Amino acid sequence: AWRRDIFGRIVWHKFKQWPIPWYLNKRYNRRRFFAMPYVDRFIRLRIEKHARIEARKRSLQKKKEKILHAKF
């Protein structure tokens, strides 16, 4: 299934085999598949961190094209 972990990310969760249903398994229930509100500020920071990386990569390509055309 597609689930949100406690860190605010979306990850594919692989199911495991158990002999009892999920609602009766105390070990499984202790696992959390939700994020509390204190994670939203970190969610934005990741998006902005990633956006900077993409901006630098696109800029560098444009700079590299300048060198090619100037050289050739």
Partner: protein
């Protein structure tokens, strides 16, 4: 007495005081992990 030997290693203490399960037990500890993830730390916890 001579100082500098305040670290008395014990793996049980180390994992209980600074381990993965300890950090996720409280929201403040989870935020500690989030900060280290955003910095890019290779080691999030002991």
């Amino acid at each position: 007495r001579a100082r500098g030997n305040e670290y008395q290693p014990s793996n049980i203490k180390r994992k209980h005081k600074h381990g993965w399960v300890r950090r996720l037990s409280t929201p403040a500890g989870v935020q500690v992990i989030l900060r280290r993830m955003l910095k890019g730390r290779k080691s999030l916890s002991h």
